Amino acid sequence: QSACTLQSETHPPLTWQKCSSGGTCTQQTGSVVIDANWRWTHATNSSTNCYDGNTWSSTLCPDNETCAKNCCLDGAAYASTYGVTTSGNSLSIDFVTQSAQKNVGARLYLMASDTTYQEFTLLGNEFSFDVDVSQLPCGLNGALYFVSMDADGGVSKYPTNTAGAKYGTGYCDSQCPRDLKFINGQANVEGWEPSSNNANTGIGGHGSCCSEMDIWEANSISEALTPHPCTTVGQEICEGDGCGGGTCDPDGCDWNPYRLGNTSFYGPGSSFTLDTTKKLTVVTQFETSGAINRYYVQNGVTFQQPNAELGSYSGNELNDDYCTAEEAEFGGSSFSDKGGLTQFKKATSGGMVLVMSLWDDYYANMLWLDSTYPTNETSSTPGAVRGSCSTSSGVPAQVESQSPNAKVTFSNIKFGPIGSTGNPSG
Ligand SMILES: CO[C@@H]1O[C@H](CO)[C@@H](O[C@@H]2O[C@H](CO)[C@@H](S[C@@H]3O[C@H](CO)[C@@H](O[C@@H]4O[C@H](CO)[C@@H](O)[C@H](O)[C@H]4O)[C@H](O)[C@H]3O)[C@H](O)[C@H]2O)[C@H](O)[C@H]1O
Ligand SMILES: *[C@@H]1O[C@H](CO)[C@@H](O)[C@H](O)[C@H]1NC(C)=O
């Protein structure tokens, strides 16, 4: 797809800190861009929509190639249309925003310039950020994560895509998402099927796969840390059912303190170690062995990831023994079939793009994160309970109606060698 300018594109600025092993941190200046799927896609020569609701224009988009040629992605009014705003090193995303249309959440990427994404090499380094999840009720997910996307959004590999990173193209993750309207410089209209419950989305014949590091997926009730390996490290297209776990691990080796047994660590109020009604700091370290360490800071008090005992595993580090014990006790073979932490280390050794989003779940109502899932299981089933939310929570239409003002705020992003981000920001 190409880019149009009926609406100017001005990326909300966002500062972050780059720290060094020497003990100092210096301020960096970037910005954020919204994913192409949220944009208005219309004819290059008019305002005629190429996509509207959950259907494509059969005239402008008879096939994937013709569609990409006839259509372009336009600019976004971040605040008024998408409820996305920034201030210094802080970024906020509102749940429901009413403009000429209703918009739900957003997915944003940190940029290095107005035409390129900022790439981060996680291995040997740590990522720190502050987050306020107080306005995130059951059913919502304020997420901060990394994915192995190309810095240019896919332009060099697929010339038919001239919009690039400036317009949020090139997404990919361990779920091999088929809801993307544009992949590899072509549309995804071929084989398109409208969602049964989301008036704005559908499923195309192709998907976009790649390694995904979910540093943070959470709301005020539950939080999870989850690495997702893929047999092909970077962005790669998939077709039909091949997208269903053919190359990527959609489940991952997840670490949810609540799911692992400590139901008093993360929650609303002073009855929890970390009070989710107030802002908190989350630091994640990627040691060279491939393991992942985590600690939190709130009101000046430091807490390492809480200890967990699962099978023969005991500790607070997300390592091979933990992931192996999890599949043995909770079930599944996806993570290990795809190479585990060894394969995932190939992703963190390379460059990954920072993603920040807010979403509700049309497939499983976010029950996998904050409730008992599947809903027919009980507390007696290992790993069934992930949070205190009712198994009846998270219905999109309901949370969108009852909590339109929900929002997540990410701030004070700091990146550098392990042990360096706790030093003074520059
Ligand atoms: C005896 O047979 C075995 O039984 C066990 C237990 O019943 C089976 O294991 C269970 O299988 C369930 C379905 O596969 C999963 S639910 C699964 O949970 C994961 C972890 O939360 C979810 O992954 C997350 O998905 C999010 C939304 O896409 C992502 O954003 C996030 O990054 C992912 O971590 C997934 O969506 C759910 O479907 C149980 O966890 C598991 O114990 C076993 O399969 C049988 O063989
Ligand atoms: C949860 O973790 C906190 C901090 O490590 C600890 O003080 C508390 O005892 C733990 N509770 C349980 C039930 O593990």
Write a three-state SS string for 259-288: CCCCCCCEECCCCCCEECCCCEEEEEEECC
Q: What is the DSSP string of 327-351?
A: HHHH---HHHHTTHHHHHHHHHTS-
Determine the distance separating the centroid of ligand 2 and the alpha carbon of 272, expressed in angstroms. 9
- Ligand 1 lined by 240 (C-beta under 6 Å): no
Determine the distance separating the centroid of ligand 2 and the alpha carbon of 261, expressed in angstroms. 9
Six-digit token string for 43: 């004819």
- What SS3 class is residue 206? strand
Q: Distance between CA atoms of 364 and 139, rounded to whole angstroms?
A: 9
Q: Distance between CA atoms of 426 and 414, rounded to whole angstroms?
A: 10
- The answer to whether the CB of 243 falls within 8 A of the CB of 213 is no
Q: Distance between CA atoms of 63 and 241, rounded to whole angstroms?
A: 20
Determine the distance separating the centroid of ligand 1 and the alpha carbon of 384, expressed in angstroms. 9
Determine the distance separating the centroid of ligand 1 and the alpha carbon of 336, expressed in angstroms. 14
- The answer to whether the CB of 71 falls within 8 A of the CB of 187 is yes
Class of residue 302 by CB neighbours under 10 A (exposed 0-12, middle 13-18, buried 19+): exposed
Type of residue at 386: R
CB atoms within 10 A of CB 102: 12
Strands 71-73 and 41-43: antiparallel
Six-digit token string for 408: 């997540």
Largest CA distance in the chain: 63
Strands 266-267 and 223-228: unpaired
Q: Distance between CA atoms of 46 and 59, rounded to whole angstroms?
A: 14
The resolution in angstroms reads 1.8
- C-alpha distances in angstroms, 218 versus 141, 238, 282, 378, 392? 5, 28, 12, 22, 18
Please list the alpha-helical segments (H only) found in 92-209: none
Q: Distance between CA atoms of 207 and 179, rounded to whole angstroms?
A: 7
Q: Distance between CA atoms of 387 and 259, rounded to whole angstroms?
A: 7
Q: Distance between CA atoms of 207 and 250, rounded to whole angstroms?
A: 13
- The alpha-carbon radius of gyration of the chain (Å, integer) is 21
Q: Which atom of ligand 1 is nearest to the CA of 251?
A: 23
- The ligand placed nearest to the CA atom of residue 264 is 2
- The ligand placed nearest to the CA atom of residue 364 is 1
Of the candidates 286, 282, 273, the one whose C-alpha atom is nearest the C-alpha of residue 143 is 282
Q: Distance between CA atoms of 63 and 74, rounded to whole angstroms?
A: 21
How is residue 246 annotated by DSSP?
S
Q: Which is catalytic among the residues 126, 212, 317, 400?
A: 212
Please report, to the nearest 10 degrees, the dihedral formed by the alpha carbons of residues 30, 34, 39, 41 taken in order: 60
- Ligand 1 lined by 252 (C-beta under 6 Å): yes
Q: Distance between CA atoms of 414 and 420, rounded to whole angstroms?
A: 9
> What are the two backbone dihedrals, phi and then psi, of residue 70, each rounded to the nearest 5 degrees?
-80, -15
- The answer to whether the CB of 321 falls within 8 A of the CB of 340 is no
Q: Distance between CA atoms of 366 and 386, rounded to whole angstroms?
A: 10
Contacts of 409 (CB under 8 A, 6+ apart): 90, 91, 92, 93, 131, 132, 279
> What are the two backbone dihedrals, phi and then psi, of residue 330, each rounded to the nearest 5 degrees?
-90, -30
**All structural domains of the chain:** 2-426 (2.70.100.10)
Ligand 2 pocket test: which of 256, 264, 272 has the largest number of ligand atoms within 8 Å of its C-beta? 264
Class of residue 158 by CB neighbours under 10 A (exposed 0-12, middle 13-18, buried 19+): buried
Six-digit token string for 388: 């205190």
- The answer to whether the CB of 128 falls within 8 A of the CB of 373 is no
Which neighbouring-strand residues pair with 372?
385
Catalytic residue flag (residue 65) = no
Q: Distance between CA atoms of 335 and 345, rounded to whole angstroms?
A: 13
Determine the distance separating the centroid of ligand 2 and the alpha carbon of 309, expressed in angstroms. 12
Q: Which atom of ligand 2 is nearest to the CA of 306?
A: 5
**Residue owning the nearest CA to atom 14 of ligand 1:** 332
Of the candidates 186, 113, 175, 184, the one whose C-alpha atom is nearest the C-alpha of residue 154 is 184
How is residue 243 annotated by DSSP?
G
Class of residue 292 by CB neighbours under 10 A (exposed 0-12, middle 13-18, buried 19+): buried
Six-digit token string for 73: 């992605």
Method used experimentally: X-ray
Q: Which helix (H) or strand (E) holds 318?
A: none
Catalytic residue flag (residue 217) = yes
Burial profile 389-422: b = 16 or more Cβ within 10 angstroms, e = fewer: beeebbbbeebbeebbebbbbbbbbbbbebebbb
Q: What share of the chain is helix, strand, coil (3-state, %, to 5)?
A: 15, 35, 50
> What are the two backbone dihedrals, phi and then psi, of residue 82, each rounded to the nearest 5 degrees?
-105, 0
- The answer to whether the CB of 415 falls within 8 A of the CB of 119 is no
- The ligand placed nearest to the CA atom of residue 147 is 1
Please list the alpha-helical segments (H only) found in 18-125: 64-70, 78-82
- Ligand 2 lined by 262 (C-beta under 6 Å): yes
